[PDB]
Ligand binder design. Structure first.
Ligand SMILES: CC1=C(/C=C/C(C)=C/C=C/C(C)=C/C(=O)O)C(C)(C)CCC1
Ligand SMILES: CC1=C(/C=C/C(C)=C/C=C/C(C)=C/C(=O)O)C(C)(C)CCC1
Lengths: 160, 164
């Protein structure tokens, strides 16, 4: 996305689907639980709190992202384990498809996800996710549509 | 029928179950573990012999069953000791997929289930898109759709029982 403006993406986002190779497984173992994300802007850094299911438990991760050479490219430096997240597509109103490249201590991981402001009528967004991820080298076998168990969402709604 | 220039000749053989809708229931789907479902369609004479596999938690079940035509082209009737089923073909491109509507009678649940069959395991994009639109205007929420997990353990048992 060239013309990007983060004021528009602040807040609570529901993780609808992900694609991973890768697955182982993671997420879930058984049963899958849905994930979610909170985007805040904290002192010119993007402060982020995600939740997701991981072998028997709902993980909560709080992270910081610094903007990386314009537009919709962000970078998360973990203990010298980088992640690179790019906004691939967005209609600026209901959904955003994200591309994550992470280096988890040697291991490279290439993830794509579909976030949505809503748990309902995500069909157009889902169809675009399937076109874009096949374009990025993922097959149908690599896409996971999250089951609508909300336990983790609810945990994140409450606080952190 | 709902599609009206249907010929079963076009639909014989192997099909994967890609998604279903049930209300819501739871868981449903399946339970745990989702295991991919599938079907073999055989034309005996005056009868459609169908053999299905699905995960009934402890194992993959192969179930063989018969269907007869029930006036109007795309409509079939299958009777089981559990109840009768009216299945109708709602949509098809005649080449890669079919969306089926099942009105069931299993001892009292006047329920419907819609299922998406496909010829293939990839490039189901447009079929899935359609399926979401049709299930939507038939009373189903996104919550009621079940996109099947690509675990193929039952499927390979179906393929192989039919293969050899
Ligand atoms: C969801 C989302 C966004 C994501 C931002 C970041 C920073 C995502 C990081 C993801 C990681 C780091 C995932 C992982 O490791 O699984 C932005 C604000 C672009 C647009 C609105 C929706
Ligand atoms: C899949 C499929 C077809 C299905 C036929 C029948 C007879 C389905 C019965 C389903 C039941 C009886 C399901 C259940 O109870 O879950 C036909 C040949 C129309 C078109 C090609 C794909």
């Amino acid at each position: 996305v060239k013309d990007f403006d983060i004021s528009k993406f602040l807040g609570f986002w529901y993780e609808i689907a992900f694609a991973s190779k890768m697955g182982t497984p993671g997420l879930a173992h058984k049963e899958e639980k849905m994930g979610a994300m909170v985007v805040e802007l904290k002192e010119n850094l993007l402060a982020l709190t995600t939740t997701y299911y991981s072998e028997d438990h709902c993980v909560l991760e709080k992270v910081t992202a610094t903007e990386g050479d314009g537009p919709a490219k962000f970078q998360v430096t973990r203990l010298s384990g980088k992640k690179e997240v790019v906004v691939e597509a967005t209609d600026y109103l209901t959904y955003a498809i994200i591309d994550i490249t992470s280096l988890v201590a040697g291991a490279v991981h290439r993830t794509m996800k579909l976030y949505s402001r809503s748990l309902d009528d995500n069909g157009e967004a889902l169809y675009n996710f399937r076109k874009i991820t096949s374009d990025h080298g993922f097959s149908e076998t690599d896409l996971y549509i999250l089951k609508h168990d909300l336990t983790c969402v609810k945990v994140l709604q409450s606080a952190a």
